[PDB]
Amino acid sequence: DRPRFSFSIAAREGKARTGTIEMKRGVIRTPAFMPVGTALKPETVRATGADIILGNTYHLMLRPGAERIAKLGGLHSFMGWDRPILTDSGGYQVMSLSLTKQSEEGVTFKSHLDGSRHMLSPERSIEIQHLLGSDIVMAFDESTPYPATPSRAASSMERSMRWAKRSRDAFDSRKEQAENAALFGIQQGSVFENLRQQSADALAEIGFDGYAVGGLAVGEGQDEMFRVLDFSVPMLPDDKPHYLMGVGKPDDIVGAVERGIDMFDSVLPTRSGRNGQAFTWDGPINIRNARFSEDLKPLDSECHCAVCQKWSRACIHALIRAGEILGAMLMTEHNIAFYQQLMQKIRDSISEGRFSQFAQDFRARYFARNS
Amino acid sequence: DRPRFSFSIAAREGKARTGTIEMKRGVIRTPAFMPVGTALKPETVRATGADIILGNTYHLMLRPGAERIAKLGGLHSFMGWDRPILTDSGGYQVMSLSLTKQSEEGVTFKSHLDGSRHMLSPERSIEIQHLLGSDIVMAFDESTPYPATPSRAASSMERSMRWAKRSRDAFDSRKEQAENAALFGIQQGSVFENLRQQSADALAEIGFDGYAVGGLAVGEGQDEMFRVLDFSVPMLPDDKPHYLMGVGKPDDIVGAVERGIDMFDSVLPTRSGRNGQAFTWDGPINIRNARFSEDLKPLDSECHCAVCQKWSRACIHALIRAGEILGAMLMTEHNIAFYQQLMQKIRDSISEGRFSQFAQDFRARYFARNS
Ligand SMILES: O=S1(=O)CC[C@@H](O)C1
Ligand SMILES: O=S1(=O)CC[C@@H](O)C1
Ligand SMILES: O=S1(=O)CC[C@@H](O)C1
Ligand SMILES: O=S1(=O)CC[C@@H](O)C1
Ligand SMILES: [Zn+2]
Ligand SMILES: [Zn+2]
């Protein structure tokens, strides 16, 4: 009988950890990369190694709507994915894509599709994520645009913490949700150490199944992101998963695991694949470049994915140049699989106590760009 | 103002001729190859060089039916092809695919699809081809299976000639058809010279816009087919087109033009393309063969088709091995275009009085198979 949510750390190296999250719909190996599910077939996404995928609540609210998804059987039935699904709260896309009114109560916003009015709040976000039936639920917070003044960073963080308690109570009010799903809280505080500590203390007092580091990957650059992670991750409870939302490039992931992060999500592998960019151990490549037109090697000569067992750079180049959808599908499958192989090498190297070496070896090769 | 049907011979070499057939829907360059239209887009088929395509009356009768096609605007609207269309009579597929009753009146047969009853005769065939709206109409004849006894060959040929007169009269009875389309008669007589002469005399007495050589390409082998063509084609009127039905391989076409044939049709380029076989100037190749997996040359290094300007053997090999429909589409486009380039080289070489040399050069290279 599988548990609701059980995080076990199997091995450590410095701040890095590797282990598992056991949930009713399956086991998640950590550090984990979650592709964004909101197209490749779900069996293809699973075969790349993904243990869990992410759904964007905001987009699902606008089309086809969470009530419709619930009537269809829930998000797992809707997406054809029967393993765990994490949903975000919707709040970030409200800031970035939609906004009629904002207050401590919640937000009202207009659909950028058809102009209809929608509402989000801690209580409404948790309820919508319940209708979607997701396994990991994100608390609803307030995002502050980058760069943020110290005043606005403190203001949004304190509101986010009040909203985190409201998210906690809303989640706990539904027995069907509280017994079967998990709830993560989100640390805020921009680049400010005292605000991050304030946030971490408040979240740990409320209590969550996992803790996200919010407010990064919004324009700040890698060096600054790493500096914030340096002091922010140790503030979170050690025995629970640490989730860096919206990150990121392969070298961002490696450096964040060095700093204690267990979970990641990013649209980058799928966006790059649609745009003709492949990730490789020698850095990203643009497959349209003429140098690939007669290159019989696969996208990456070490990649274990199904695409690289069969297709050459030359032939993917031909498909992409012709605008054939198969080209984009193959690139996208490869990129998601490459990300999963990166996570597997990270997990194995932590287990063997050679992750610090792997990270240095990885960077030297990825940035040399000898592709 | 384009004429109904005007055949002009521009140049000759021995028995070979090159010229044009002018019709209301366009000009047909001869010797001509007609792809079988009954999928690639019609604009793709046109871009390969085809001036006219063939429709199979029998298949169109069974699905969706000629009355339905007429209500949809005719076969040109149905197929998206606004240039000339030749239709066969349906009689060959009755023998080869369906057959309730046969007599001098006509035939009743059962649809191999749904068992429904259909009827063909000279009068019904011409009427159905009128409903289809085709530009070149084939007289309805009686096919004799191969090999045929002298008695059965004479019996089917004499009936075919009585049916050719009935086809002539049926065609002439519809002013809309007789003023806008053309009618071809079909010579029969198996391998027997006296029967072929009997047939040719009867057809010329009736009078037709063009004359087909029927009863070949049904198992007899090329040497025997060529021997029959040697005496049969000179029996037909010189100033009208000569049509060899259902032929054939590239070397069959070359040898038949040497013997006075102006028009051809065959499913071979499309069937081969779906089966992973490409025609080349060095003979056919099976693209699945391992030797092509890293071959960066196009299917044929002299072929002018759109496929060979872009796609390598290696990449078409990859698509075909994966079962991707694009692979079959590219092979089929190439094969139809290769056939049209063969016809163009035949036309140009006759015009220049070097066709006998082209035919010898063609055979030496095609049969050496240095691909
Ligand atoms: O990310 S997925 O597995 C592929 C598209 C949806 O079926 C969810
Ligand atoms: O079905 S929904 O997601 C909830 C009500 C609207 O915001 C659309
Ligand atoms: O042979 S065709 O041009 C292609 C399939 C039909 O549109 C007729
Ligand atoms: O519409 S049809 O081609 C003429 C009547 C049947 O043979 C089907
Ligand atoms: Zn790969
Ligand atoms: Zn070609």
**What value, to the nearest 5°, has the Cα angle with vertex B327 and ends B325 and B332?**
95
Which residues contact ligand 1 via a Cβ below 6 A?
A: A 35, 37, 39-40, 42, 45, 53, 79-81
Radius of gyration, alpha carbons of chain A: 20
Interchain contact, B294 vs A296, CB within 8 Å: yes
Q: Tokens 């109904």 correspond to what residue?
A: B4
What pairing do the DSSP bridges indicate for beta strands B32-35 and A277-278? Answer: unpaired
With a CB-CB cutoff of 8 Å, which residues 333-362 of chain B face chain A?
none
Catalytic residues of A, by residue number, are 88, 265
The Cα–Cα gap between A89 and A213 comes to 14
Determine, for residues B314 and A310 on separate chains, whether the beta-carbon distance falls below 8 Å: no
Q: Which of B206, B218, B237, B61 is nearest to B143 (CA)?
A: B218
Note the resolution in Å, 1 decimal. 1.7
Q: Rounded to 10 degrees, what is the CA torsion of A280, A284, A289, A291?
A: -40
Distances (CA, A) of A95 to A90, A129, A189: 9, 19, 17
In 3D space, the residue among B226, B191, B242, B219 whose CA is nearest the CA of residue B363 turns out to be B226
Q: Which residues have C-beta within 8 Å of that of residue B186, sequence separation ≥ 6? A: B138, B139, B141, B160, B164, B203, B211, B212, B213, B214, B245
**For ligand 2, atom 7: residue with the closest CA:** A118
Q: Which ligand is nearest to the CA of A121?
A: 2
Contact between B12 and B350 (Cβ < 8 Å): yes
Gap between the terminal Cα atoms of chain B: 47
Q: What letter represents residue B78's amino acid?
A: F
Residues A88, A243: Cα–Cα separation, whole Å: 12
The count of other CB atoms within 10 Å of the CB of residue A165 is 17
- Indicate the residue type of B347: R
**Contact predicate B89/B57, CB 8 Å:** yes
CA distances from A134 to A80, A121, A240, B152, B277 (A): 13, 18, 19, 77, 50
B326 touching A, CB under 8 A? yes
Nearest to A280 by CA among A252, A304, A257, A264: A304
CA distance B263 to B186: 13
A297 touches B at CB < 8 Å: no
- The amino acid that residue B39 corresponds to is A
Q: For ligand 5, a single-atom ion, which residues have Cβ within 5 Å?
A: A 303, 305, 307-308, 334
Give me the amino acid identity at B303.
C
Query: What is the position in ligand 4's atom list of the atom closest to the CA of B67?
Result: 1
CB A37 within 8 A of CB A87: no
Per the DSSP assignment, residues forming a β-bridge with B26 are B23
A141 known member of a binding site: yes
Residue A349 DSSP SS3: helix
On whether any CB of chain A is under 8 Å from the CB of B205, the answer is: no
How distant is the alpha carbon of residue A272 from its chain centre?
16
Rounded Cα gap, residues A208 and B19, in angstroms: 85
For residue A184, the cross-strand partners are A138, A210
Is there a contact between A146 and A218 (Cβ–Cβ < 8 Å)?
yes
Task: Give yes or no for a contact between B100 and B109, defined as CB atoms under 8 angstroms apart.
Answer: yes
Q: Is the dihedral of CA B110, B115, B117, B118 positive or negative?
A: negative
Which residues have a Cβ under 8 Å from the Cβ of A333 and sit 6 or more positions away?
A: A40, A44, A48, A273, A305, A306, A307
Could you write out the three-class secondary structure of chain B?
CCCCEEEEEEEEECCEEEEEEEECCEEEEECEEEEECCCCCHHHHHHCCCCCEEECHHHHHHCCCHHHHHHCCCHHHHHCCCCCEEECCCHHHHHHHCCCEECCCCEEEECCCCCCEEEECHHHHHHHHHHHCCCEEECCCCCCCCCCCHHHHHHHHHHHHHHHHHHHHHHHCCHHHHCCCEEEEEECCCCCHHHHHHHHHHHHHHCCCEEEECCCCCCCCHHHHHHHHHHHHHHCCCCCCEEECCCCCHHHHHHHHCCCCCEEEECHHHHHHHCCEECCCCCCEECCCHHHCCCCCCCCCCCCCHHHHHCCHHHHHHHHHHCCHHHHHHHHHHHHHHHHHHHHHHHHHHHCCCHHHHHHHHHHHHHHCCC
On the CB side of B281, how many CA atoms lie within 13 Å of its CA?
17
CA distance B167 to B159: 12
Give all strands (DSSP E) within chain A, no chain letters: 5-13, 16-23, 26-30, 32-35, 53-55, 85-87, 101-102, 107-110, 117-120, 136-138, 182-187, 210-213, 242-244, 263-266, 277-278, 285-286
Task: Count CA within 13 A, CB hemisphere, residue A195.
Answer: 25
CA distance A291 to chain B (A): 14
* Smallest-distance ligand from the CA of B85: 3
Cβ proximity of B251 and B225 under 8 Å: no
Tell me which amino acid residue A50 is: A
DSSP 8-state class, residue A344 = H
Q: Which chain A residues contact residue B330 at CB under 8 A? A: none
Angle at CA A151, nearest 5°, toward A150 and A155?
Answer: 115
Name the nearest CA neighbour of A246 among A215, A224, A270: A215
Structure letter (DSSP) for residue A291? G
DSSP A219: S
State which residue of chain B sits closest to A315, comparing Cα positions. B315
Q: Do the annotations mark residue A315 as ligand-binding?
A: no
- AA identity, residue A47: A
The amino acid that residue A266 corresponds to is S
Among residues A320, A362, A321, which one has the least CA distance to residue A345? A362
CB under 8 Å to B366, separation ≥6 — which residues?
A: B250, B251, B281, B282, B283
DSSP 8-state symbol, A292: G
A38, A57, A61, A63, best to mutate for ligand 2 pocket (most atoms within 8 Å of CB): A61
Q: Please, which experimental method was used?
A: X-ray
Are the C-beta atoms of residues B94 and B81 closer than 8 Å to each other? Answer: no
* Residue pair B16/B194 in contact by the 8 Å Cβ criterion: no
* Residue B368 CB-density burial (10 A; 0-12 exposed, 13-18 middle, 19+ buried): exposed
Nearest C-alpha neighbor of B131 from the set B72, B187, B183, B186: B72
Evaluate whether B275 touches B246 at the Cβ level (below 8 Å).
Answer: no
| Ramachandran sector of residue B129 (left: φ over 0; alpha: ψ -120 to 50; beta: rest) | alpha
3-class secondary structure per residue, A100-161: CEECCCCEEEECCCCCCEEEECHHHHHHHHHHHCCCEEECCCCCCCCCCCHHHHHHHHHHHH
Instruction: Give the residue numbers of B annotated as catalytic, written as ranges.
Output: 88, 265
Structure token pair of residue A322: 């012709």
Min Cα distance B318 → chain A (Å) is 7
| Of the partner residues A294, A311, A326, the one whose CB lies closest to the CB of residue B326 | A326
Q: What is the C-alpha to C-alpha distance for residues B333 and B300, in angstroms, rounded to an integer?
A: 13
d(CA A334, CA A48): 8
**Partners of B136 in the β-ladder:** B86, B182
Q: Write the CB contacts of B118 (distance below 8 Å, at least 6 apart in sequence).
A: B61, B62, B108, B109, B110, B111
- Listed residue (B314, B291, B321) closest to A315, CA to CA: B314
Say how many Å lie between the first and final Cα of chain A, rounded. 47
Handedness of CA A315, A321, A322, A328 (dihedral sign): positive
Q: Which residue in the set A294, A322, A326 is minimally distant from B296, CB to CB?
A: A294
Please tell me the distance in Å from A290's CA to the nearest CA on chain B.
13
List domains and CATH numbers for chain A: 5-272+335-368 (3.20.20.105)
Report the run of H or E that residue A324 belongs to, with start and end.
none
